[PDB]
Amino acid sequence: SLIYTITLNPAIDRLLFIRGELEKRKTNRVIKTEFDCGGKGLHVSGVLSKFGIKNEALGIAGSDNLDKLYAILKEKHINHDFLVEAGTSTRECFVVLSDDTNGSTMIPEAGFTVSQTNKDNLLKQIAKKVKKEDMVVIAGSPPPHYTLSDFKELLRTVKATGAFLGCDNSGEYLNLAVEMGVDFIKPNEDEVIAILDEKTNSLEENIRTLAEKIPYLVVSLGAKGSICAHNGKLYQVIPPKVQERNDTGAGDVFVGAFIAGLAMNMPITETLKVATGCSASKVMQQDSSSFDLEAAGKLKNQVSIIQLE
Amino acid sequence: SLIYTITLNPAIDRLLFIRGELEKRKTNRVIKTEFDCGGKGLHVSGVLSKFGIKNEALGIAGSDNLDKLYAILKEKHINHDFLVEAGTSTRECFVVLSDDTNGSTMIPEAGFTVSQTNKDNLLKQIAKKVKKEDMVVIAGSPPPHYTLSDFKELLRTVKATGAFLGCDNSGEYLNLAVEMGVDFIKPNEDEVIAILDEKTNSLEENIRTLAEKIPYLVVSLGAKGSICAHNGKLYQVIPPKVQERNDTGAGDVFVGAFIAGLAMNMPITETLKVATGCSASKVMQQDSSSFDLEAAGKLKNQVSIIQLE
Numbered sequence A, B: 001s002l003i004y005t006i007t008l009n010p011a012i013d014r015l016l017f018i019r020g021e022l023e024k025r026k027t028n029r030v031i032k033t034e035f036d037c038g039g040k041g042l043h044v045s046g047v048l049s050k051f052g053i054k055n056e057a058l059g060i061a062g063s064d065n066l067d068k069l070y071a072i073l074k075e076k077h078i079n080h081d082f083l084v085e086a087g088t089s090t091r092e093c094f095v096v097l098s099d100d101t102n103g104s105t106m107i108p109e110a111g112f113t114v115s116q117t118n119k120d121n122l123l124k125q126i127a128k129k130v131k132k133e134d135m136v137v138i139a140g141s142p143p144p145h146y147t148l149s150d151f152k153e154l155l156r157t158v159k160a161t162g163a164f165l166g167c168d169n170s171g172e173y174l175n176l177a178v179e180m181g182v183d184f185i186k187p188n189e190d191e192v193i194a195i196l197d198e199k200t201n202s203l204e205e206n207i208r209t210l211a212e213k214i215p216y217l218v219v220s221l222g223a224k225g226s227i228c229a230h231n232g233k234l235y236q237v238i239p240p241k242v243q244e245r246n247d248t249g250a251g252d253v254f255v256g257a258f259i260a261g262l263a264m265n266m267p268i269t270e271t272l273k274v275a276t277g278c279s280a281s282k283v284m285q286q287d288s289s290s291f292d293l294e295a296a297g298k299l300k301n302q303v304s305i306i307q308l309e
């Protein structure tokens, strides 16, 4: 078995380190530049690779800066089998941060237009690659012009393989995944609104209702932790208090760690502790994806989990 | 004869267009991306090329993204003969702007370390290329580790050719150029402080004193225009009022136009009107280098020049 991530809109993140705050209408000299991979699915692959668990990244990348993207992926130990879009470049996301502050300003390019041929190639690739014993994680919003209809086809193609399907998406894409029937979703506190019943005020009740259609339902609540519904049980997960530096990417780390736990057949409570420990470590870091495996293994032991009756 | 520009720290400018103001600690989606050349000397070359006047750009560029830089230069009709630094990349300067606002936030990378071999190659190149009937314009601060001593050697090498030498530099580099003896400098209102005599309060008097050592002295004053000293005369140059959008690069356009005027043997007052007209047109534009040759030719006719007795 293996875990596949699907990144429909990959990116190359260029971290621009400056001194102090980012002042608009002013000159902000860059002290140093670092690179990381962009696209939620790739971040999830990076997390899985840190665990050493077998995984492969799928998606559509631009031909013009393919060597650069691949070089970054090798630095992250991410194995891949990307489809390539000729005459285009994988988008670049500029992330401005400082060793003096906690924030991060993100300036992302939108992404390119995927050809129908490549949309079709991805489906054929999934059909021949993915087996029922595998796990597939789709994360991140589709690139421009990759319609709801296209996403529906993608979800259906994955469902036909019998593989476990997890989706960390938002808006209409998240709504569709839930309607279609997926195994796992992790909307954060704001994203979950898209699938909430307006006439049902209680968040717990809404979660218990949605749990009827989703095997592993996680609603993440930032520093408050998360609430997870599984096998008719509801868990309130609380992380230990950590010194936050940058909570960007905390969700991607949570998803990667959660999936890793499931892949290793860890009981749901342990999987939740591992995911929470890893994401807590992430928030302690400057960038938007890194985390300390050492700190996480300890933090996992300081996560409280209480079943809500 | 020909005009040579020297850009010791070239760059590739990536213009990132967003909606509204650049909000720090927030996500600022890029609507579109455009490219331009960076490095003051290259901007001056771009201006000269718009005039159709013969010119060639010199300097040291990185090998790793040379094709990209050259592609941009061809788009600007800039002829060049750059030295190349192996294993390095020409720095990228990120410029965030919007069709909704007037500002521009600049996030520039510092530049690479030039090898002694290339510092020496530039001097040998200048010695064999430049003739006494030529004009040489050095603009922009040197890259990291390109010392005052290195700059002194550069200025001396240019002086030995007999060519006209113009310098649009600041700080210690500007001070050195003046001490060394150059034909033209254009410090703006803030930069001129570096060469002012603290015990001499009057700006006019300071300019008249410095004019003893500089044939063509221009102190630019932004929207107020400029003051130029030449052949024992002092000129107050006032531009027509224009709707400012982005005054970044107004100085580079002024320098390119001023040099073009001198190359065409235009009387000093006409040269000043042309430079002022072009820079006024530049300030009306969004980016940091473009200007309308059509608007400038008209604006030039609405520039007032009064001799200060």
Ligand SMILES: Nc1ncnc2c1ncn2[C@@H]1O[C@H](COP(=O)(O)OP(=O)(O)OP(=O)(O)O)[C@@H](O)[C@H]1O
Pocket (backbone or CB within 6 Å): A187, A188, A189, A220, A221, A222, A223, A224, A225, A226, A239, A240, A241, A242, A244, A247, A248, A249, A250, A251, A252, A253, A254, A275, A276, A279, A280, A283
């Ligand atoms: N300040 C914090 N302290 C401890 N843990 C945190 C903090 N912020 C986030 N986390 C952990 O990370 C998980 C990821 O969470 P959040 O709900 O912010 O995800 P998200 O907003 O989707 O993330 P992303 O930025 O990747 O989209 C949380 O449920 C939590 O366990």
Ligand SMILES: Nc1ncnc2c1ncn2[C@@H]1O[C@H](COP(=O)(O)OP(=O)(O)OP(=O)(O)O)[C@@H](O)[C@H]1O
Pocket (backbone or CB within 6 Å): B187, B188, B189, B220, B221, B222, B223, B224, B225, B226, B239, B240, B241, B242, B244, B247, B248, B249, B250, B251, B252, B253, B254, B275, B276, B279, B280, B283
């Ligand atoms: N608001 C304006 N209206 C009309 N003309 C202007 C305006 N701002 C600048 N200029 C013109 O452009 C010339 C270039 O000027 P300024 O003194 O700002 O240069 P600078 O700050 O060195 O430029 P740069 O941004 O290239 O470094 C001015 O002397 C003036 O003639």
Ligand SMILES: [Mg+2]
Pocket (backbone or CB within 6 Å): A009, A010, A038, A039, A040, A041, A139, A140, A141
């Ligand atoms: Mg994405």
Ligand SMILES: [Mg+2]
Pocket (backbone or CB within 6 Å): A188, A222, A247, A250, A251
């Ligand atoms: Mg969050």
Ligand SMILES: [Mg+2]
Pocket (backbone or CB within 6 Å): A168, A188, A251, A252
């Ligand atoms: Mg998220």
Ligand SMILES: [Mg+2]
Pocket (backbone or CB within 6 Å): B009, B010, B038, B039, B040, B041, B139, B140, B141
């Ligand atoms: Mg420069």
Ligand SMILES: [Mg+2]
Pocket (backbone or CB within 6 Å): B188, B222, B247, B250, B251
């Ligand atoms: Mg100015």
Ligand SMILES: [Mg+2]
Pocket (backbone or CB within 6 Å): B168, B188, B251, B252
């Ligand atoms: Mg200037």
